[PDB]
Amino acid sequence: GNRRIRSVGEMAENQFRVGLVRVERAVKERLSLGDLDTLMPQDMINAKPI
Amino acid sequence: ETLRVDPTNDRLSALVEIYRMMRPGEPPTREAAESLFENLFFSEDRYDLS
Amino acid sequence: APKKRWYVVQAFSGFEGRVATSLREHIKLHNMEDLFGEVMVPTEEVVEIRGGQRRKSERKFFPGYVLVQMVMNDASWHLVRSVPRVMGFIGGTSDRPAPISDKEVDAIMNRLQQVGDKPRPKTLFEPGEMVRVNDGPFADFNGVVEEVDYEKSRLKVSVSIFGRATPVELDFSQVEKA
DNA sequence: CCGAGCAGCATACATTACTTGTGAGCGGATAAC
DNA sequence: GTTATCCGCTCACAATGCCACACGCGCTGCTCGG
């Protein structure tokens, strides 16, 4: 009643959210320093950390 | 008995105590300790109960 | 009249300039254009215009650190520390910073002035060390630097020409290792 | 203008995470003169 | 008050042997480069 199983999807989305929060921080600081309206949402984020 | 052993007396003293405890050696302001405690819980991002 | 004493912050390996940019941006955020008046990252330039590395190179007085002209208030303390990528302060006990003294301030200021006035070729040669020659006329020779020169920058170098040693004026670009 | 090396970077943060069992030095409470 | 006394606090420091197999082993934006 207190020990739950954690399947593949759940752990996978956990690691995904972990890898996502760091790119969130990166894109936040790049949106901060970077221009407001010159960009296209395809380079302030990097698929590398995900 | 706890309130006896409880050294603090005021809410802001609670904030500064928890703030020092979390990470010692830091200048405890109102905003610093308050935001630290409001990030330890009561924050959709830094915390979640699943 | 509490002057904004200078201070120093430990950055990461090679983010010092970017850290200073982001710090100025956080200043423009919090409008603390008074307390965080000046922020500086010094540098130097070695100008060897031949032999691989071409025409310039940039050094730092001391890497990993950034210099600011903040003031002492806990709010400004965090505002300095609440920037993208910095470690803590560099000074007295953590949470109680200490200022780089005014003597050191003017010292580093004079260093900055000297490096800003004269872009000067460093990586020099010391009198009495053997060295090859990459010159056209004197290809694949090797001699000892008999006397070094900086403004003329032409390396009085002794080398075996017609038997006995002779001094030559082979310029910097015509000087190999060491 | 991007390809190929480099120098010092807990990626900057909040990372992080229940008992493991035992000894040993240590700092705040304690009995006595 | 002080001087020695003691008790909980925190940290160091150990966890059977082999065998086999497997997998992996920085990087990254600054720097040297044309």
Coordinates of all heavy atoms in Angstrom, one line a residue, chain C residues 106-163:
Chain C
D106 N 44.3 51.9 -8.0 CA 45.1 52.7 -8.9 C 46.2 51.9 -9.6 O 46.6 52.2 -10.7 CB 45.6 53.9 -8.1 CG 46.7 53.5 -7.1 OD1 47.8 53.1 -7.5 OD2 46.3 53.5 -5.9
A107 N 46.7 50.9 -8.9 CA 47.7 50.0 -9.5 C 47.2 49.4 -10.8 O 47.7 49.5 -11.9 CB 48.2 49.0 -8.5
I108 N 46.0 48.7 -10.6 CA 45.4 48.0 -11.8 C 45.0 49.0 -12.8 O 45.0 48.8 -14.0 CB 44.3 47.1 -11.3 CG1 44.1 45.9 -12.3 CG2 43.0 47.9 -11.2 CD1 45.3 45.0 -12.4
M109 N 44.6 50.3 -12.4 CA 44.2 51.3 -13.3 C 45.4 51.7 -14.1 O 45.3 51.9 -15.4 CB 43.7 52.5 -12.5 CG 43.0 53.5 -13.4 SD 41.6 52.9 -14.3 CE 40.6 52.2 -12.9
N110 N 46.6 51.9 -13.5 CA 47.8 52.2 -14.3 C 48.1 51.1 -15.3 O 48.5 51.3 -16.4 CB 49.0 52.5 -13.4 CG 48.8 53.8 -12.6 OD1 47.7 54.3 -12.4 ND2 49.9 54.4 -12.2
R111 N 48.0 49.8 -14.8 CA 48.3 48.7 -15.7 C 47.3 48.8 -16.9 O 47.7 48.6 -18.1 CB 48.1 47.4 -15.0 CG 48.8 47.3 -13.7 CD 50.3 47.3 -13.9 NE 51.0 47.7 -12.7 CZ 52.3 47.4 -12.4 NH1 53.1 46.8 -13.4 NH2 52.8 47.6 -11.2
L112 N 46.0 49.1 -16.7 CA 45.1 49.2 -17.7 C 45.4 50.3 -18.7 O 45.3 50.2 -19.9 CB 43.7 49.3 -17.2 CG 42.5 49.2 -18.2 CD1 42.5 47.9 -18.9 CD2 41.2 49.4 -17.5
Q113 N 45.9 51.4 -18.1 CA 46.3 52.6 -19.0 C 47.4 52.2 -19.9 O 47.4 52.5 -21.1 CB 46.6 53.8 -18.1 CG 45.5 54.7 -17.9 CD 45.9 56.0 -17.2 OE1 47.0 56.1 -16.7 NE2 45.1 57.0 -17.3
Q114 N 48.5 51.5 -19.3 CA 49.6 51.2 -20.1 C 49.3 50.2 -21.2 O 49.8 50.3 -22.3 CB 50.7 50.6 -19.2 CG 51.7 51.6 -18.6 CD 51.3 52.0 -17.2 OE1 51.2 51.2 -16.3 NE2 51.0 53.3 -17.0
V115 N 48.4 49.2 -20.9 CA 48.0 48.2 -21.9 C 47.1 48.9 -22.9 O 47.1 48.4 -24.1 CB 47.4 47.0 -21.3 CG1 46.1 47.3 -20.6 CG2 47.2 45.9 -22.3
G116 N 46.4 49.9 -22.6 CA 45.5 50.6 -23.5 C 46.2 51.6 -24.4 O 45.8 51.8 -25.6
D117 N 47.3 52.1 -23.9 CA 48.1 53.1 -24.7 C 48.9 52.5 -25.8 O 48.7 52.8 -27.0 CB 49.0 53.9 -23.8 CG 48.2 54.7 -22.8 OD1 47.2 55.3 -23.1 OD2 48.7 54.9 -21.6
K118 N 49.7 51.5 -25.5 CA 50.7 50.9 -26.4 C 50.4 49.4 -26.6 O 50.7 48.6 -25.8 CB 52.1 51.0 -25.8 CG 52.1 50.9 -24.3 CD 53.4 51.5 -23.8 CE 53.4 53.0 -23.7 NZ 54.7 53.5 -23.1
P119 N 49.8 49.0 -27.8 CA 49.7 47.6 -28.1 C 51.0 47.0 -28.4 O 51.6 47.4 -29.5 CB 48.7 47.6 -29.3 CG 48.9 49.0 -29.9 CD 49.2 49.9 -28.8
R120 N 51.6 46.2 -27.6 CA 53.0 45.9 -27.7 C 53.2 44.4 -27.8 O 52.6 43.6 -27.1 CB 53.7 46.3 -26.4 CG 53.8 47.9 -26.3 CD 54.7 48.3 -25.2 NE 55.4 49.5 -25.6 CZ 56.4 49.6 -26.5 NH1 56.9 48.5 -27.0 NH2 57.0 50.8 -26.8
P121 N 54.1 44.0 -28.8 CA 54.4 42.5 -29.0 C 55.1 41.9 -27.8 O 56.3 42.2 -27.5 CB 55.2 42.5 -30.2 CG 55.8 43.9 -30.3 CD 54.8 44.8 -29.7
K122 N 54.4 41.0 -27.1 CA 55.0 40.2 -26.0 C 55.5 38.9 -26.6 O 55.6 38.8 -27.9 CB 54.1 40.1 -24.9 CG 53.5 41.4 -24.3 CD 54.6 42.3 -23.7 CE 55.0 43.4 -24.6 NZ 56.0 44.3 -24.0
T123 N 55.9 37.9 -25.8 CA 56.5 36.7 -26.2 C 57.9 37.0 -26.8 O 58.2 36.8 -28.0 CB 55.7 35.9 -27.2 OG1 55.6 36.6 -28.4 CG2 54.2 35.7 -26.6
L124 N 58.7 37.6 -26.0 CA 60.0 38.2 -26.4 C 61.1 37.1 -26.4 O 60.8 35.9 -26.1 CB 60.4 39.3 -25.5 CG 60.4 39.0 -24.0 CD1 61.7 38.6 -23.5 CD2 59.8 40.2 -23.2
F125 N 62.3 37.5 -26.6 CA 63.5 36.6 -26.6 C 64.5 37.2 -25.7 O 64.7 38.4 -25.6 CB 64.0 36.5 -28.0 CG 63.0 36.1 -29.1 CD1 62.9 36.8 -30.3 CD2 62.2 35.0 -28.8 CE1 62.0 36.4 -31.2 CE2 61.3 34.6 -29.8 CZ 61.2 35.3 -31.0
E126 N 65.2 36.2 -25.0 CA 66.1 36.6 -23.9 C 67.5 36.4 -24.4 O 67.9 35.5 -25.1 CB 65.9 35.7 -22.7 CG 64.5 36.0 -22.0 CD 63.3 35.4 -22.8 OE1 63.5 34.8 -23.8 OE2 62.2 35.6 -22.3
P127 N 68.4 37.3 -24.0 CA 69.8 37.4 -24.6 C 70.6 36.1 -24.2 O 71.0 36.0 -23.1 CB 70.4 38.6 -24.0 CG 69.2 39.4 -23.4 CD 68.3 38.4 -22.9
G128 N 70.9 35.3 -25.2 CA 71.8 34.2 -25.0 C 71.1 32.8 -25.2 O 71.6 31.8 -24.7
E129 N 70.1 32.7 -26.0 CA 69.4 31.5 -26.2 C 69.4 31.2 -27.7 O 69.2 32.0 -28.6 CB 67.9 31.6 -25.8 CG 67.1 32.7 -26.4 CD 65.9 33.1 -25.6 OE1 65.6 32.4 -24.6 OE2 65.2 34.1 -26.0
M130 N 69.7 29.9 -28.0 CA 69.8 29.5 -29.4 C 68.4 29.5 -30.0 O 67.4 29.3 -29.4 CB 70.4 28.1 -29.5 CG 69.8 27.1 -28.6 SD 70.8 25.6 -28.4 CE 69.7 24.5 -27.5
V131 N 68.4 29.6 -31.4 CA 67.1 29.8 -32.1 C 67.4 29.5 -33.6 O 68.4 30.0 -34.1 CB 66.5 31.1 -31.8 CG1 67.5 32.2 -32.2 CG2 65.3 31.3 -32.7
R132 N 66.5 28.9 -34.3 CA 66.5 28.7 -35.7 C 66.1 30.0 -36.4 O 65.7 31.0 -35.8 CB 65.7 27.5 -36.1 CG 66.2 26.2 -35.9 CD 65.4 25.1 -36.5 NE 64.7 25.6 -37.7 CZ 65.4 25.7 -38.9 NH1 66.7 25.4 -39.0 NH2 64.7 26.2 -39.9
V133 N 66.2 29.9 -37.7 CA 65.8 31.1 -38.6 C 64.9 30.6 -39.7 O 65.1 29.6 -40.4 CB 67.1 31.7 -39.2 CG1 66.7 32.9 -40.1 CG2 68.0 32.1 -38.1
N134 N 63.7 31.3 -39.8 CA 62.7 31.0 -40.9 C 62.8 32.1 -42.0 O 61.9 32.2 -42.8 CB 61.3 31.0 -40.3 CG 61.0 32.3 -39.5 OD1 61.5 32.5 -38.4 ND2 60.1 33.1 -40.1
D135 N 63.9 32.8 -42.0 CA 64.1 33.8 -43.1 C 64.3 33.1 -44.4 O 64.7 32.0 -44.5 CB 65.3 34.7 -42.8 CG 65.7 35.6 -43.9 OD1 65.0 36.5 -44.3 OD2 66.9 35.4 -44.4
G136 N 64.0 33.9 -45.5 CA 64.2 33.4 -46.8 C 65.7 33.3 -47.1 O 66.3 32.2 -47.3
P137 N 66.4 34.5 -47.2 CA 67.8 34.5 -47.4 C 68.6 33.6 -46.4 O 69.6 33.0 -46.9 CB 68.2 36.0 -47.2 CG 67.0 36.7 -47.6 CD 65.8 35.8 -47.3
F138 N 68.2 33.4 -45.2 CA 68.9 32.6 -44.2 C 68.1 31.5 -43.7 O 68.1 31.2 -42.5 CB 69.4 33.5 -43.1 CG 70.4 34.6 -43.4 CD1 70.0 35.8 -44.0 CD2 71.7 34.3 -43.2 CE1 70.9 36.7 -44.3 CE2 72.7 35.3 -43.5 CZ 72.3 36.5 -44.1
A139 N 67.5 30.7 -44.6 CA 66.7 29.6 -44.2 C 67.5 28.5 -43.6 O 68.6 28.2 -44.0 CB 65.9 29.0 -45.4
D140 N 66.9 27.9 -42.5 CA 67.5 26.7 -41.9 C 68.9 27.0 -41.3 O 69.8 26.2 -41.3 CB 67.5 25.5 -42.8 CG 66.2 24.7 -42.8 OD1 65.3 25.1 -42.0 OD2 66.1 23.7 -43.5
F141 N 69.1 28.3 -40.8 CA 70.2 28.6 -40.0 C 69.8 28.6 -38.5 O 68.6 28.5 -38.2 CB 70.8 30.0 -40.3 CG 71.7 29.9 -41.5 CD1 72.0 31.1 -42.2 CD2 72.2 28.7 -42.0 CE1 72.9 31.1 -43.3 CE2 73.0 28.7 -43.1 CZ 73.4 29.9 -43.8
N142 N 70.8 28.6 -37.6 CA 70.5 28.7 -36.2 C 71.6 29.4 -35.5 O 72.8 29.0 -35.7 CB 70.3 27.3 -35.7 CG 71.3 26.3 -36.2 OD1 72.2 26.7 -36.9 ND2 71.2 25.0 -35.8
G143 N 71.3 30.3 -34.6 CA 72.3 31.1 -33.9 C 71.8 31.5 -32.6 O 70.6 31.2 -32.2
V144 N 72.6 32.3 -31.9 CA 72.3 32.7 -30.5 C 72.0 34.2 -30.5 O 72.7 35.0 -31.2 CB 73.5 32.4 -29.6 CG1 73.1 32.8 -28.1 CG2 73.9 31.0 -29.6
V145 N 70.9 34.6 -29.8 CA 70.5 36.0 -29.8 C 71.5 36.8 -29.0 O 71.6 36.8 -27.8 CB 69.1 36.1 -29.2 CG1 68.1 35.6 -30.2 CG2 69.0 35.3 -27.9
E146 N 72.4 37.5 -29.8 CA 73.5 38.2 -29.2 C 73.1 39.5 -28.4 O 73.7 39.9 -27.5 CB 74.6 38.5 -30.2 CG 75.9 38.8 -29.7 CD 77.0 39.1 -30.7 OE1 76.6 39.0 -31.9 OE2 78.1 39.4 -30.4
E147 N 71.9 40.1 -28.9 CA 71.4 41.3 -28.3 C 70.0 41.5 -28.8 O 69.7 41.4 -30.0 CB 72.3 42.5 -28.6 CG 71.6 43.8 -28.3 CD 72.2 45.0 -29.1 OE1 73.5 44.9 -29.3 OE2 71.6 46.0 -29.3
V148 N 69.1 41.7 -27.8 CA 67.6 41.8 -28.2 C 67.2 43.3 -28.3 O 67.9 44.1 -27.7 CB 66.8 41.0 -27.2 CG1 66.7 41.8 -25.9 CG2 65.4 40.7 -27.7
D149 N 66.2 43.5 -29.1 CA 65.7 44.9 -29.3 C 64.2 44.8 -29.4 O 63.6 43.8 -29.8 CB 66.3 45.5 -30.5 CG 65.9 44.7 -31.8 OD1 66.0 43.5 -31.7 OD2 65.7 45.4 -32.8
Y150 N 63.5 45.9 -28.9 CA 62.1 45.9 -28.8 C 61.4 46.9 -29.8 O 60.5 46.5 -30.6 CB 61.6 46.2 -27.4 CG 61.8 45.0 -26.5 CD1 62.0 45.1 -25.1 CD2 61.9 43.7 -27.0 CE1 62.2 44.0 -24.3 CE2 62.1 42.6 -26.2 CZ 62.2 42.8 -24.8 OH 62.4 41.7 -24.0
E151 N 61.8 48.2 -29.7 CA 61.2 49.1 -30.6 C 61.7 48.9 -32.0 O 60.9 48.8 -33.0 CB 61.5 50.6 -30.2 CG 63.0 50.8 -29.8 CD 63.3 50.4 -28.4 OE1 62.5 49.8 -27.7 OE2 64.4 50.8 -27.9
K152 N 63.0 48.7 -32.2 CA 63.6 48.3 -33.5 C 63.1 46.9 -33.8 O 62.8 46.6 -35.0 CB 65.1 48.4 -33.5 CG 65.6 49.8 -33.1 CD 67.0 49.7 -32.5 CE 66.8 49.1 -31.1 NZ 66.1 49.9 -30.1
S153 N 63.0 46.0 -32.8 CA 62.4 44.7 -33.0 C 63.1 43.9 -34.1 O 62.4 43.4 -35.0 CB 60.9 44.8 -33.1 OG 60.5 45.8 -34.1
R154 N 64.4 43.8 -34.0 CA 65.1 43.1 -35.1 C 66.2 42.2 -34.7 O 67.0 41.7 -35.5 CB 65.7 44.2 -36.1 CG 65.4 43.9 -37.5 CD 65.6 45.1 -38.4 NE 64.5 46.0 -38.2 CZ 64.5 47.1 -37.5 NH1 65.7 47.5 -36.9 NH2 63.5 47.9 -37.4
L155 N 66.3 41.8 -33.4 CA 67.0 40.6 -32.9 C 68.4 40.5 -33.4 O 68.7 39.7 -34.3 CB 66.2 39.4 -33.3 CG 65.1 38.9 -32.3 CD1 65.8 38.5 -31.0 CD2 64.1 39.9 -32.1
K156 N 69.3 41.4 -32.9 CA 70.7 41.2 -33.2 C 71.1 39.7 -32.8 O 71.1 39.4 -31.6 CB 71.5 42.2 -32.4 CG 73.0 42.1 -32.6 CD 73.4 42.5 -34.0 CE 73.4 44.1 -34.1 NZ 74.5 44.6 -33.3
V157 N 71.5 38.9 -33.7 CA 71.7 37.5 -33.5 C 73.0 37.1 -34.1 O 73.3 37.3 -35.3 CB 70.5 36.7 -34.2 CG1 71.0 35.2 -34.4 CG2 69.3 36.7 -33.3
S158 N 73.8 36.5 -33.3 CA 75.1 35.9 -33.8 C 74.9 34.5 -34.4 O 74.1 33.7 -33.9 CB 76.1 35.8 -32.7 OG 77.3 35.2 -33.2
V159 N 75.6 34.3 -35.5 CA 75.4 33.0 -36.2 C 76.6 32.8 -37.1 O 77.4 33.8 -37.4 CB 74.1 33.0 -37.1 CG1 74.2 34.2 -38.1 CG2 73.9 31.7 -37.8
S160 N 76.9 31.5 -37.4 CA 78.1 31.2 -38.2 C 78.0 31.6 -39.6 O 77.3 30.9 -40.4 CB 78.4 29.7 -38.0 OG 79.5 29.3 -38.8
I161 N 78.5 32.7 -40.0 CA 78.6 33.2 -41.4 C 80.1 33.3 -41.7 O 80.8 34.0 -41.0 CB 77.8 34.4 -41.6 CG1 76.5 34.4 -40.9 CG2 77.6 34.6 -43.1 CD1 75.5 33.3 -41.5
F162 N 80.5 32.8 -42.8 CA 81.9 32.6 -43.2 C 82.8 32.3 -42.0 O 83.6 33.1 -41.6 CB 82.4 33.9 -44.0 CG 81.9 35.2 -43.5 CD1 82.6 35.9 -42.5 CD2 80.7 35.7 -44.0 CE1 82.1 37.1 -42.0 CE2 80.3 36.9 -43.5 CZ 81.0 37.6 -42.5
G163 N 82.5 31.1 -41.4 CA 83.3 30.6 -40.4 C 83.0 31.2 -39.0 O 82.0 30.7 -38.4

